[PDB]
CSV table of C-alpha atoms in Angstrom, one decimal:
chain,number,residue,atom,x,y,z
A,1,UNK,CA,0.0,0.1,0.0
A,2,UNK,CA,1.1,3.2,-1.2
A,3,UNK,CA,0.2,6.4,0.9
A,4,UNK,CA,0.7,10.2,0.2
A,5,UNK,CA,2.3,11.8,2.8
A,6,UNK,CA,0.6,14.7,4.9
A,7,UNK,CA,2.5,17.7,6.3
A,8,UNK,CA,2.4,20.4,8.8
A,9,UNK,CA,5.1,23.0,9.2
A,10,UNK,CA,4.8,25.3,12.1
A,11,UNK,CA,6.8,26.8,15.1
A,12,UNK,CA,7.4,24.8,18.2
A,13,UNK,CA,6.5,28.2,20.3
A,14,UNK,CA,4.3,31.3,19.2
A,15,UNK,CA,6.3,32.8,16.3
A,16,UNK,CA,7.5,36.2,17.6
A,17,UNK,CA,9.8,37.7,14.7
A,18,UNK,CA,13.6,38.3,16.1
A,19,UNK,CA,12.9,35.8,18.9
A,20,UNK,CA,15.1,32.0,18.7
A,21,UNK,CA,12.3,29.5,17.7
A,22,UNK,CA,11.8,25.9,16.5
A,23,UNK,CA,10.3,25.1,13.0
A,24,UNK,CA,8.8,22.1,12.8
A,25,UNK,CA,8.0,20.1,9.8
A,26,UNK,CA,5.2,17.2,10.6
A,27,UNK,CA,4.7,14.6,8.1
A,28,UNK,CA,2.6,11.8,8.3
A,29,UNK,CA,0.4,9.0,7.1
A,30,UNK,CA,3.1,8.0,4.5
A,31,UNK,CA,4.3,4.4,3.4
A,32,UNK,CA,6.9,3.1,2.5
A,33,UNK,CA,9.2,4.5,4.9
A,34,UNK,CA,11.9,5.6,2.6
A,35,UNK,CA,11.2,9.8,2.2
A,36,UNK,CA,13.4,12.5,1.9
A,37,UNK,CA,12.4,16.0,4.2
A,38,UNK,CA,14.2,19.2,3.9
A,39,UNK,CA,13.5,22.4,5.7
A,40,UNK,CA,14.1,25.5,3.7
A,41,UNK,CA,14.8,29.4,4.1
A,42,UNK,CA,14.0,31.6,1.4
A,43,UNK,CA,14.2,29.0,-1.0
A,44,UNK,CA,17.4,27.4,0.3
A,45,UNK,CA,18.4,24.4,2.3
A,46,UNK,CA,18.8,24.7,6.1
A,47,UNK,CA,22.0,22.8,7.2
A,48,UNK,CA,21.3,21.5,11.0
A,49,UNK,CA,17.8,19.4,10.5
A,50,UNK,CA,17.0,17.2,13.7
A,51,UNK,CA,14.8,14.4,12.7
A,52,UNK,CA,12.9,12.5,15.3
A,53,UNK,CA,12.5,8.9,15.3
A,54,UNK,CA,10.3,7.4,12.9
A,55,UNK,CA,7.3,5.5,13.7
A,56,UNK,CA,4.0,4.6,12.7
A,57,UNK,CA,0.7,5.2,13.4
A,58,UNK,CA,-2.8,3.1,13.9
A,59,UNK,CA,-3.4,2.5,10.3
A,60,UNK,CA,0.5,1.7,9.9
A,61,UNK,CA,1.3,4.6,7.8
A,62,UNK,CA,4.8,6.2,8.9
A,63,UNK,CA,5.3,9.5,10.5
A,64,UNK,CA,7.9,11.4,11.4
A,65,UNK,CA,9.2,15.1,13.1
A,66,UNK,CA,11.7,17.3,11.1
A,67,UNK,CA,13.0,20.4,13.0
A,68,UNK,CA,15.5,23.2,13.1
A,69,UNK,CA,16.2,26.3,15.4
A,70,UNK,CA,15.0,29.4,13.3
A,71,UNK,CA,14.5,33.0,14.2
A,72,UNK,CA,11.3,34.0,12.3
A,73,UNK,CA,11.8,37.6,10.6
A,74,UNK,CA,9.0,39.3,9.0
A,75,UNK,CA,10.3,38.8,5.4
A,76,UNK,CA,12.3,35.6,5.6
A,77,UNK,CA,10.3,32.5,4.1
A,78,UNK,CA,10.3,29.0,5.6
A,79,UNK,CA,9.1,26.0,4.1
A,80,UNK,CA,9.3,21.9,4.2
A,81,UNK,CA,10.1,20.0,1.0
A,82,UNK,CA,9.1,16.5,1.0
A,83,UNK,CA,10.3,13.6,-1.2
A,84,UNK,CA,8.3,10.6,-1.5
A,85,UNK,CA,7.5,7.9,-3.7
A,86,UNK,CA,3.7,8.6,-3.3
A,87,UNK,CA,4.2,11.9,-4.9
A,88,UNK,CA,5.4,12.4,-8.4
A,89,UNK,CA,7.0,15.7,-7.5
A,90,UNK,CA,8.4,17.1,-4.2
A,91,UNK,CA,6.0,18.7,-1.8
A,92,UNK,CA,6.7,21.8,-0.6
A,93,UNK,CA,4.7,23.2,2.1
A,94,UNK,CA,5.5,27.0,3.3
A,95,UNK,CA,5.5,27.7,7.0
A,96,UNK,CA,2.4,30.0,7.5
A,97,UNK,CA,3.0,31.5,11.0
A,98,UNK,CA,-1.3,31.4,11.0
A,99,UNK,CA,-1.2,28.5,8.8
B,1,UNK,CA,-6.8,8.8,33.6
B,2,UNK,CA,-6.0,5.9,30.5
B,3,UNK,CA,-2.7,4.5,30.2
B,4,UNK,CA,-0.8,2.5,27.7
B,5,UNK,CA,2.4,0.6,26.9
B,6,UNK,CA,3.2,0.2,23.3
B,7,UNK,CA,6.2,-1.2,21.3
B,8,UNK,CA,6.5,-0.6,17.8
B,9,UNK,CA,8.8,-2.6,15.6
B,10,UNK,CA,9.2,-1.9,11.7
B,11,UNK,CA,11.5,-4.0,9.3
B,12,UNK,CA,12.4,-2.7,6.0
B,13,UNK,CA,14.4,-4.8,3.1
B,14,UNK,CA,16.8,-3.2,0.9
B,15,UNK,CA,18.8,-5.8,-1.0
B,16,UNK,CA,22.0,-4.9,-2.2
B,17,UNK,CA,22.5,-2.5,0.1
B,18,UNK,CA,22.9,-4.0,3.4
B,19,UNK,CA,20.9,-6.1,5.5
B,20,UNK,CA,17.0,-5.0,6.9
B,21,UNK,CA,16.2,-1.9,8.3
B,22,UNK,CA,15.0,-2.7,11.6
B,23,UNK,CA,13.9,0.2,13.7
B,24,UNK,CA,11.5,-0.1,17.4
B,25,UNK,CA,10.2,2.3,19.6
B,26,UNK,CA,8.5,1.9,23.1
B,27,UNK,CA,5.7,4.1,24.3
B,28,UNK,CA,4.0,5.2,27.5
B,29,UNK,CA,0.8,7.0,26.4
B,30,UNK,CA,1.8,9.6,24.0
B,31,UNK,CA,5.5,9.8,25.1
B,32,UNK,CA,8.3,7.9,23.3
B,33,UNK,CA,10.6,6.6,25.8
B,34,UNK,CA,12.8,3.4,24.3
B,35,UNK,CA,14.4,2.9,20.7
B,36,UNK,CA,16.3,0.3,18.9
B,37,UNK,CA,17.8,1.0,15.2
B,38,UNK,CA,19.1,-1.4,13.5
B,39,UNK,CA,21.8,1.1,11.4
B,40,UNK,CA,23.5,2.1,14.6
B,41,UNK,CA,26.9,1.9,14.6
B,42,UNK,CA,26.0,-0.2,17.8
B,43,UNK,CA,22.0,-1.1,17.8
B,44,UNK,CA,21.3,-0.9,21.1
B,45,UNK,CA,17.6,-0.3,23.5
B,46,UNK,CA,18.3,3.6,24.2
B,47,UNK,CA,16.2,5.8,26.3
B,48,UNK,CA,14.5,8.4,24.6
B,49,UNK,CA,12.8,9.9,27.9
B,50,UNK,CA,14.6,11.6,30.6
B,51,UNK,CA,13.0,9.4,33.2
B,52,UNK,CA,14.7,6.1,31.8
B,53,UNK,CA,18.1,7.5,32.0
B,54,UNK,CA,18.4,6.2,35.6
B,55,UNK,CA,18.0,2.4,34.8
B,56,UNK,CA,21.3,1.1,34.6
B,57,UNK,CA,23.3,-1.1,31.9
B,58,UNK,CA,21.4,-4.4,33.1
B,59,UNK,CA,18.3,-3.1,31.8
B,60,UNK,CA,19.4,-1.8,28.7
B,61,UNK,CA,21.4,-5.0,28.0
B,62,UNK,CA,18.6,-7.0,28.3
B,63,UNK,CA,16.3,-4.9,26.2
B,64,UNK,CA,19.0,-4.8,23.4
B,65,UNK,CA,19.3,-8.7,23.7
B,66,UNK,CA,15.5,-9.2,22.8
B,67,UNK,CA,15.4,-6.2,20.5
B,68,UNK,CA,18.1,-8.1,18.7
B,69,UNK,CA,16.3,-11.5,18.8
B,70,UNK,CA,13.1,-9.5,17.2
B,71,UNK,CA,15.5,-8.0,14.4
B,72,UNK,CA,16.6,-11.7,13.2
B,73,UNK,CA,13.0,-12.8,13.6
B,74,UNK,CA,12.2,-9.8,11.1
B,75,UNK,CA,15.1,-10.7,8.9
B,76,UNK,CA,13.8,-14.3,8.8
B,77,UNK,CA,10.3,-13.1,8.3
B,78,UNK,CA,10.4,-10.5,5.6
B,79,UNK,CA,12.6,-13.5,3.1
B,80,UNK,CA,9.6,-15.7,4.3
B,81,UNK,CA,6.5,-13.4,3.6
B,82,UNK,CA,8.4,-12.6,0.2
B,83,UNK,CA,7.9,-16.4,-0.4
B,84,UNK,CA,4.5,-16.8,0.7
B,85,UNK,CA,3.6,-13.8,-1.7
B,86,UNK,CA,6.1,-15.1,-4.5
B,87,UNK,CA,7.8,-11.4,-4.6
B,88,UNK,CA,10.9,-11.3,-6.8
B,89,UNK,CA,13.9,-10.6,-5.3
B,90,UNK,CA,15.3,-7.0,-5.0
B,91,UNK,CA,12.3,-5.7,-3.5
B,92,UNK,CA,11.8,-3.7,-0.7
B,93,UNK,CA,9.0,-4.8,1.6
B,94,UNK,CA,8.0,-3.7,5.2
B,95,UNK,CA,7.0,-5.6,8.1
B,96,UNK,CA,5.4,-3.7,10.9
B,97,UNK,CA,4.5,-5.1,14.2
B,98,UNK,CA,2.9,-3.1,17.5
B,99,UNK,CA,1.4,-4.8,20.7
B,100,UNK,CA,0.6,-3.2,23.7
B,101,UNK,CA,-1.5,-2.8,26.6
B,102,UNK,CA,-4.2,-0.1,27.9
B,103,UNK,CA,-4.5,0.5,31.5
B,104,UNK,CA,-8.1,1.6,32.7
B,105,UNK,CA,-8.4,4.3,35.2
B,106,UNK,CA,-9.2,1.8,37.8
B,107,UNK,CA,-5.4,0.8,36.8
B,108,UNK,CA,-6.7,-3.0,35.5
B,109,UNK,CA,-5.9,-4.2,32.6
B,110,UNK,CA,-8.5,-2.6,30.0
B,111,UNK,CA,-7.3,-4.4,26.9
B,112,UNK,CA,-4.3,-5.5,25.0
B,113,UNK,CA,-3.3,-6.1,21.3
B,114,UNK,CA,-0.8,-7.5,18.9
B,115,UNK,CA,-0.7,-7.0,14.9
B,116,UNK,CA,1.1,-7.4,12.4
B,117,UNK,CA,1.3,-5.6,8.5
B,118,UNK,CA,3.4,-6.6,5.6
B,119,UNK,CA,3.5,-3.6,3.1
B,120,UNK,CA,1.5,-1.7,5.3
B,121,UNK,CA,-1.5,-4.2,5.1
B,122,UNK,CA,-3.3,-5.9,8.2
B,123,UNK,CA,-1.6,-9.3,8.2
B,124,UNK,CA,-2.3,-11.2,11.4
B,125,UNK,CA,-3.7,-9.7,14.3
B,126,UNK,CA,-4.3,-11.2,17.9
B,127,UNK,CA,-8.0,-11.0,18.6
B,128,UNK,CA,-9.6,-9.2,21.9
B,129,UNK,CA,-9.6,-12.6,23.3
B,130,UNK,CA,-5.8,-12.8,23.0
B,131,UNK,CA,-6.5,-16.5,22.3
B,132,UNK,CA,-7.0,-16.3,18.5
B,133,UNK,CA,-6.0,-14.8,15.6
B,134,UNK,CA,-7.5,-13.1,12.5
B,135,UNK,CA,-5.6,-13.9,9.7
B,136,UNK,CA,-6.3,-11.5,6.3
B,137,UNK,CA,-5.4,-13.9,3.5
B,138,UNK,CA,-3.8,-17.5,3.1
B,139,UNK,CA,-0.3,-16.1,3.7
B,140,UNK,CA,-1.3,-15.2,6.7
B,141,UNK,CA,-3.4,-18.0,7.7
B,142,UNK,CA,-0.3,-20.1,6.9
B,143,UNK,CA,1.5,-18.4,9.8
B,144,UNK,CA,-1.7,-18.7,11.7
B,145,UNK,CA,-1.7,-22.4,11.8
B,146,UNK,CA,1.8,-22.0,12.6
B,147,UNK,CA,1.5,-19.8,15.8
B,148,UNK,CA,-1.6,-21.9,17.0
B,149,UNK,CA,0.7,-24.9,16.9
B,150,UNK,CA,3.4,-22.7,19.1
B,151,UNK,CA,0.9,-21.4,21.7
B,152,UNK,CA,2.3,-18.2,20.5
B,153,UNK,CA,-1.3,-16.6,21.5
B,154,UNK,CA,-1.1,-17.9,25.2
B,155,UNK,CA,2.2,-16.3,25.4
B,156,UNK,CA,1.4,-13.1,24.1
B,157,UNK,CA,-1.7,-12.9,26.4
B,158,UNK,CA,0.8,-14.0,29.4
B,159,UNK,CA,2.7,-11.0,28.4
B,160,UNK,CA,0.1,-8.5,27.8
B,161,UNK,CA,-1.7,-9.4,30.8
B,162,UNK,CA,1.2,-9.3,32.9
B,163,UNK,CA,4.6,-8.3,32.0
B,164,UNK,CA,3.1,-5.4,30.0
B,165,UNK,CA,1.1,-4.3,32.3
B,166,UNK,CA,3.4,-4.4,35.4
B,167,UNK,CA,6.2,-2.5,33.3
B,168,UNK,CA,3.5,0.0,32.1
B,169,UNK,CA,2.6,0.7,36.2
B,170,UNK,CA,6.4,0.5,36.3
B,171,UNK,CA,7.3,3.4,34.0
B,172,UNK,CA,4.6,5.3,34.9
B,173,UNK,CA,6.1,5.3,38.4
B,174,UNK,CA,9.5,6.1,36.8
B,175,UNK,CA,7.9,9.0,34.8
B,176,UNK,CA,5.8,10.1,37.3
B,177,UNK,CA,5.9,13.8,37.3
B,178,UNK,CA,5.5,14.0,33.4
B,179,UNK,CA,3.7,10.7,32.4
B,180,UNK,CA,1.0,11.6,35.3
B,181,UNK,CA,0.9,15.5,34.8
B,182,UNK,CA,-1.5,16.5,32.2
B,183,UNK,CA,-0.2,20.0,30.9
B,184,UNK,CA,-3.4,22.1,30.0
B,185,UNK,CA,-4.0,23.7,26.9
B,186,UNK,CA,-2.8,27.3,26.3
B,187,UNK,CA,-6.0,28.5,24.3
B,188,UNK,CA,-6.5,31.7,22.6
B,189,UNK,CA,-8.3,32.4,19.3
B,190,UNK,CA,-7.0,34.5,16.5
B,191,UNK,CA,-8.5,36.5,13.9
B,192,UNK,CA,-7.9,36.2,10.1
B,193,UNK,CA,-8.9,38.3,6.9
B,194,UNK,CA,-10.4,35.9,4.3
B,195,UNK,CA,-12.7,37.6,2.0
B,196,UNK,CA,-14.2,41.0,1.9
B,197,UNK,CA,-17.3,39.8,4.5
B,198,UNK,CA,-15.5,37.0,6.1
B,199,UNK,CA,-12.6,36.0,8.6
B,200,UNK,CA,-11.1,33.1,10.0
B,201,UNK,CA,-11.6,32.5,13.8
B,202,UNK,CA,-9.0,30.1,14.5
B,203,UNK,CA,-9.0,28.4,18.0
B,204,UNK,CA,-5.9,27.1,19.5
B,205,UNK,CA,-4.8,24.6,21.9
B,206,UNK,CA,-1.2,24.9,23.0
B,207,UNK,CA,1.2,23.0,24.8
B,208,UNK,CA,-1.2,20.4,26.0
B,209,UNK,CA,-0.5,16.7,27.4
B,210,UNK,CA,-1.8,13.8,26.7
B,211,UNK,CA,-2.4,14.7,23.0
B,212,UNK,CA,-6.0,13.7,23.3
B,213,UNK,CA,-7.6,17.0,23.4
B,214,UNK,CA,-11.7,18.5,22.1
B,215,UNK,CA,-11.6,21.6,20.1
B,216,UNK,CA,-15.2,22.5,18.8
B,217,UNK,CA,-16.5,25.7,17.5
B,218,UNK,CA,-20.1,26.8,18.0
B,219,UNK,CA,-22.7,29.4,17.9
B,220,UNK,CA,-25.2,29.9,20.4
B,221,UNK,CA,-25.1,26.4,21.8
B,222,UNK,CA,-25.3,24.7,17.9
B,223,UNK,CA,-22.1,23.3,17.1
B,224,UNK,CA,-20.6,24.1,14.2
B,225,UNK,CA,-19.3,21.0,13.1
B,226,UNK,CA,-19.3,21.4,9.3
B,227,UNK,CA,-17.9,24.8,9.1
B,228,UNK,CA,-14.8,23.5,11.2
B,229,UNK,CA,-11.7,23.3,10.1
B,230,UNK,CA,-9.1,21.0,12.2
B,231,UNK,CA,-5.6,20.0,12.0
B,232,UNK,CA,-4.4,16.9,13.1
B,233,UNK,CA,-2.9,17.1,16.6
B,234,UNK,CA,0.8,17.7,16.5
B,235,UNK,CA,3.8,17.5,18.9
B,236,UNK,CA,5.6,20.8,19.8
B,237,UNK,CA,8.4,19.0,19.8
B,238,UNK,CA,9.2,19.7,23.5
B,239,UNK,CA,6.9,16.6,24.7
B,240,UNK,CA,3.1,18.6,24.5
B,241,UNK,CA,1.0,19.1,21.8
B,242,UNK,CA,-0.5,21.3,19.4
B,243,UNK,CA,-3.8,21.6,17.7
B,244,UNK,CA,-6.3,24.4,16.2
B,245,UNK,CA,-9.6,24.5,14.6
B,246,UNK,CA,-11.1,27.3,12.5
B,247,UNK,CA,-14.5,28.3,11.4
B,248,UNK,CA,-15.3,30.9,8.3
B,249,UNK,CA,-17.3,33.4,9.9
B,250,UNK,CA,-18.7,36.9,8.6
B,251,UNK,CA,-17.0,40.1,9.5
B,252,UNK,CA,-18.6,42.1,12.2
B,253,UNK,CA,-20.0,38.5,13.5
B,254,UNK,CA,-16.7,37.3,14.8
B,255,UNK,CA,-17.8,37.7,19.0
B,256,UNK,CA,-20.9,35.8,18.4
B,257,UNK,CA,-19.0,32.4,17.7
B,258,UNK,CA,-17.1,30.3,20.6
B,259,UNK,CA,-14.5,27.4,20.8
B,260,UNK,CA,-14.5,24.8,23.2
B,261,UNK,CA,-11.3,23.6,24.7
B,262,UNK,CA,-11.9,20.2,26.3
B,263,UNK,CA,-8.8,18.6,27.7
B,264,UNK,CA,-7.9,16.3,30.7
B,265,UNK,CA,-5.9,19.2,32.2
B,266,UNK,CA,-8.3,21.5,32.5
B,267,UNK,CA,-10.8,22.2,35.7
B,268,UNK,CA,-13.5,22.6,32.9
B,269,UNK,CA,-13.9,23.4,29.5
B,270,UNK,CA,-12.9,26.5,28.2
B,271,UNK,CA,-14.8,28.6,26.0
B,272,UNK,CA,-13.3,31.8,24.0
B,273,UNK,CA,-15.1,34.0,21.6
B,274,UNK,CA,-12.8,36.9,20.4
C,1,UNK,CA,9.9,-4.0,28.7
C,2,UNK,CA,9.8,-5.7,25.3
C,3,UNK,CA,7.9,-9.1,25.1
C,4,UNK,CA,10.6,-12.0,25.0
C,5,UNK,CA,8.3,-14.4,22.2
C,6,UNK,CA,9.5,-14.5,19.1
C,7,UNK,CA,6.9,-14.3,16.2
C,8,UNK,CA,8.4,-15.9,13.0
C,9,UNK,CA,6.0,-15.6,9.9
């Protein structure tokens, strides 16, 4: 069974321009477990990206939390790019302070 | 106050590129506490919760030992499933296993469970009686007859009703100050432009634990069940969760709406308006 | 604690 990943991009703490925070990229409901997740800042790859231990939920589909330290500004863009067999092209979801 | 101890196992083959990928995660409620990863330079059962750091070497050695036994069984099981389904060589296949015990408020066993999946599909499952199996196809049935012959159900029932429950209460003991804590949601309502005469009221529930939460938007009693956008509960990454619910509403009429946050950590239901 | 019972398919 092949299932397409769901993505949520959001900060750990309430976003405040200039305040260090953590940006999360929650990717769920995907299978097989092979997947590539990338976090971007103004379209460019963010180096250090922490990855939770992959696991699976009730329906067997996998999920994982990728995150990085970041300091939101009014202008900087943040996204999560996910590559997975279920998808023909990479899925890029932008961080929406409001989402 | 319901609890559970669950262990998750996943084996993913990768021919010509190493031995199967075996990873195991252990959970107490909505908190992961142990983990084993076959790809680590030194695969071992390791703590993933701060309250599991005073367990000493013996504990991990044992777990690491058991984890490896299972890892091997999964290597062989992969190869076996490959045959039962006659899949060509060189393909990647996943084998999943999850079992655990739910403990009721009274502290007694609520129920136990154990099931497998192959390629992400239900394969075989121990029934709620903890004595019989549910085989999804002819392949699974083969596994069923074998496990029946080995009296495996009996073994799982014993572990699920005993050892599983004993370790749960025990881990709850270790993780007291966090596992039994119940961080209530920090809830607020946000306003958002959408159209010329409609705004989006987003009800946020932040930093709560456990993950189980209830968010609903309503207009004068009536629940706006269909107009409600709900985001799957998500981990803040620090051990607590986040979730929000939104409703599309006409400008000037925001104040009329109200969202109701329900969660174990609250003295009583919250009611937010904006 | 992990169950010790091995489940071979």
